[PDB]
Ligand binder design. Structure first.
Ligand SMILES: *[C@@H]1O[C@H](CO)[C@@H](O)[C@H](O)[C@H]1NC(C)=O
Ligand SMILES: *[C@@H]1O[C@H](CO)[C@@H](O)[C@H](O)[C@H]1NC(C)=O
Lengths: 49, 50
């Protein structure tokens, strides 16, 4: 699922010493909930990207 | 959960606010016993207030 892919991307960014990122998306069905999920994950994470 | 008797500066301010705003206050005590903040207890990443 795309949410698992987003979590993997966040973990890769954390391991790569990349604590700053920008989310650039495009209008396409299904991506809004993915953006909401990644925002909730980065907010609830103690890493603090 | 026995009912105790509590008072002090905070309850006096609460009484003043209730008198000025017609509030019917229901005093309760924190079961956790702490101020509480974002802490990780379980479910990995969880910044839930306690
Ligand atoms: C709360 O404030 C509003 C406007 O400042 C006022 O109309 C209202 O009466 C106030 N509430 C009480 C309980 O006085
Ligand atoms: C206080 O406000 C309440 C509204 O919830 C009203 O019913 C009551 O009459 C007010 N008391 C006085 C003394 O004006």
């Amino acid at each position: 699922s795309i949410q698992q892919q987003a979590t993997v991307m966040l973990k890769i960014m954390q391991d790569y010493d990349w604590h700053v990122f920008s989310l650039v998306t495009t209008i396409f069905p299904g991506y809004r909930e993915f953006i909401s999920f990644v925002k909730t994950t980065v907010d609830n994470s103690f890493v603090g990207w | 959960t026995v009912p105790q008797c509590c008072y002090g500066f905070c309850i006096d301010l609460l009484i003043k606010l209730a008198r000025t705003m017609n509030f019917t206050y229901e005093v309760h005590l924190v079961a956790d016993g702490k101020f509480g903040t974002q802490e990780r207890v379980n479910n990995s990443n969880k910044k839930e207030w306690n």
